[PDB]
Amino acid sequence: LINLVESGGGVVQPGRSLRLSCAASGFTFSRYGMHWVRQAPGKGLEWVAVVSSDGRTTYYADSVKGRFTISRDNSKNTLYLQMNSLRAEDTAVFYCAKEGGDNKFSFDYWGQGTLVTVSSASTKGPSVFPLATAALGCLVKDYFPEPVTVSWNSGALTSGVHTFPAVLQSSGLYSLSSVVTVPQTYTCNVDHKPSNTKVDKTV
Amino acid sequence: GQLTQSPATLSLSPGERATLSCRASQSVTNYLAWYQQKPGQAPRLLIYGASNRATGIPARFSGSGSGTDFTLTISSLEPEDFAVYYCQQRDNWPPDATFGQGTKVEIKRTVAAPSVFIFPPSDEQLKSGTASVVCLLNNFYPREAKVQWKVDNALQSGNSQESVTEQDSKDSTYSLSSTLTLSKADYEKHKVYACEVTHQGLRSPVTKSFNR
Numbered sequence: 001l002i003n004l005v006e007s008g009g010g011v012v013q014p015g016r017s018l019r020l021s022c023a024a025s026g027f028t029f030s031r032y033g034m035h036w037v038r039q040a041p042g043k044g045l046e047w048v049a050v051v052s053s054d055g056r057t058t059y060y061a062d063s064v065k066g067r068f069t070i071s072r073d074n075s076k077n078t079l080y081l082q083m084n085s086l087r088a089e090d091t092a093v094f095y096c097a098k099e100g101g102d103n104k105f106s107f108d109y110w111g112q113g114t115l116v117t118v119s120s121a122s123t124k125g126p127s128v129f130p131l132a133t134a135a136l137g138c139l140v141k142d143y144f145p146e147p148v149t150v151s152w153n154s155g156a157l158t159s160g161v162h163t164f165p166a167v168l169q170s171s172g173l174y175s176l177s178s179v180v181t182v183p184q185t186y187t188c189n190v191d192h193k194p195s196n197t198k199v200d201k202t203v
Numbered sequence: 204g205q206l207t208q209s210p211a212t213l214s215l216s217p218g219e220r221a222t223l224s225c226r227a228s229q230s231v232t233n234y235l236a237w238y239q240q241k242p243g244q245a246p247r248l249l250i251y252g253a254s255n256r257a258t259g260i261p262a263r264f265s266g267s268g269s270g271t272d273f274t275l276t277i278s279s280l281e282p283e284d285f286a287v288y289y290c291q292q293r294d295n296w297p298p299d300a301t302f303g304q305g306t307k308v309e310i311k312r313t314v315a316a317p318s319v320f321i322f323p324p325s326d327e328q329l330k331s332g333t334a335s336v337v338c339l340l341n342n343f344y345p346r347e348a349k350v351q352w353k354v355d356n357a358l359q360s361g362n363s364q365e366s367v368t369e370q371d372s373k374d375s376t377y378s379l380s381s382t383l384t385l386s387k388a389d390y391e392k393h394k395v396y397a398c399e400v401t402h403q404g405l406r407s408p409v410t411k412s413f414n415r
């Protein structure tokens with residue numbers, strides 16, 4: 001019934017701008033104040049800003065004022081977040097939340113979130129190197145941006161597989177490992193959509 | 204202004220009582236709220252006004268407290284309650300909301316030492332101009348684990364990054380990967396590469412090494 005749908009996230013270079021949208025349905029939008037709440041990778045919730053139910057008064061977290069401006073269009077039931085002068089520190093998932101009906105100091109509904117990635121790195125497919133009870137795997141290195149999917153033996157090998165979370169290297173590029181323990185042939189199927197890179201790597 | 208949650212991690216089994224708490228820096232005019240968040244999904248309101256259950260929240264979740272101390276109680280844990288919980292505070296003005304730093308409810312299990320593996324850089328990667336050394340810690344419990352890299356006995360600091368999986372759905376263990384990055388010329392100048400692992404399941408540290 002009540003629902004928040006966000007759009008606008010994207011991979012951008014620092015200094016550029018992005019604009020976030022949050023469309024609301026299922027309740028009378030004009031009655032509630034709306035907020036933006038972000039969550040950087042591996043972090044907790046960090047409030048960003050709010051705009052009164054009538055779009056007249058706004059307030060910002062100190063790390064974003066002068067750069068981000070929050071606004072709304074009650075005839076469209078849409079909340080916005082204009083983000084300018086984006087910096088690396090901004091990358092995070094941004095959520096829109098509604099001040100609650102029973103209690104306005106709580107957030108009763110949240111959007112699914114929209115990803116904001118700010119980096120000066122450009123799109124690049126990964127290089128897959130072999131990692132050779134016994135263990136073996138594949139080092140899926142130097143790619144940008146997320147995500148990459150890894151499967152073994154076209155999906156037929158699944159027990160003992162550990163595909164670790166990607167790590168952001170100091171070079172601005174991501175890297176991840178996928179291993180499997182075996183007490184036959186072994187191939188990692190790596191797929192990186194953002195760059196149309198596909199590799200079946202037999203270890 | 205400041206919300207502090209405790210403990211940072213809670214290791215319980217299904218059916219047990221989970222008790223988490225938030226300490227507000229000052230007295231709170233506006234009764235705190237609690238949220239549950241699962242990996243990759245949006246937070247969902249559990250408790251508002253300190254004691255009221257949001258819509259559709261099962262009875263096992265309860266909250267209480269006033270002034271500066273609030274507690275979130277899960278009377279009996281169900282499999283789906285293993286997640287991260289945040290507490291939150293907000294005034295009429297200034298309007299900014301503030302969040303606790305989160306408490307993770309994790310699955311309790313028996314101790315299990317990791318089996319360790321070290322992987323040299325592949326010749327393939329060496330001809331690319333780079334060198335990655337990988338140390339794998341497989342299926343261990345609890346979470347806490349220490350990896351120490353050594354190159355010809357020189358302690359390495361600042362040039363390694365590790366990654367950890369979520370609790371395995373079958374055995375409830377964790378797995379950790381540690382990658383040591385080196386310029387290849389650097390890698391070529393040394394002999395002994397070693398990864399020493401310290402863990403509660405191990406009575407003495409274990410080190411896996413290889414000679415270039």
Ligand SMILES: C[C@@H]1O[C@@H](O[C@@H]2[C@@H](O)[C@@H](O)[C@@H](CO)O[C@H]2O)[C@H](O)[C@H](O)[C@H]1O
Pocket residue numbers: 032033034050051052053057058059099104294295296297298
């Ligand atoms: C953005 C807005 O900020 C606060 O709104 C209150 C409002 O309810 C009135 O009380 C006015 C005027 O006197 O004061 C404002 O502080 C509340 O935090 C709202 O929930 C927010 O939407």
